[PDB]
Amino acid sequence: GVVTSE
Amino acid sequence: GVVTSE
Amino acid sequence: GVVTSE
Amino acid sequence: GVVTSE
């Protein structure tokens, strides 16, 4: 799946 | 942080 | 995830 | 048939 981290 | 598990 | 076809 | 998506 997708993890985005900022 | 993050952990995803599939 | 896990799938089995018999 | 088996199709898996994660």
Beta carbons of B5 and C1 less than 8 angstroms apart: no
> How many CA atoms lie within 13 Å of A4's alpha carbon, on the beta-carbon side?
1
Q: Nearest-CA distance from A5 to chain B in Å?
A: 8
B5 contacts on A by Cβ (under 8 Å):
none
Beta carbons of D2 and C1 less than 8 angstroms apart: no
Q: Taking every pair of C-alpha atoms in chain C, what is the biggest distance, in angstroms? A: 17
For residues C2 and B5, give the distance between their C-alpha atoms in angstroms, rounded to a whole number. Answer: 13
Cβ neighbours of residue C2 under 8 Å, at least 6 residues apart? Answer: none
Output the six-digit token pair for A5. Answer: 């981290």
Name the structure determination technique.
Answer: X-ray
Task: Tell me, in Å, the resolution of the deposited structure.
Answer: 1.9
Q: Least CA distance to B5: which residue of chain A? A: A1
D6 contacts on C by Cβ (under 8 Å):
1
Output the six-digit token pair for B4. Answer: 């995803």
Output the six-digit token pair for A1. Answer: 């799946």
| Contacts of D1-5 spanning 24+ positions with Cβ under 8 A | D2/C3, D2/C5, D4/C1, D4/C3
Cβ neighbours of residue C3 under 8 Å, at least 6 residues apart? Answer: D2, D4
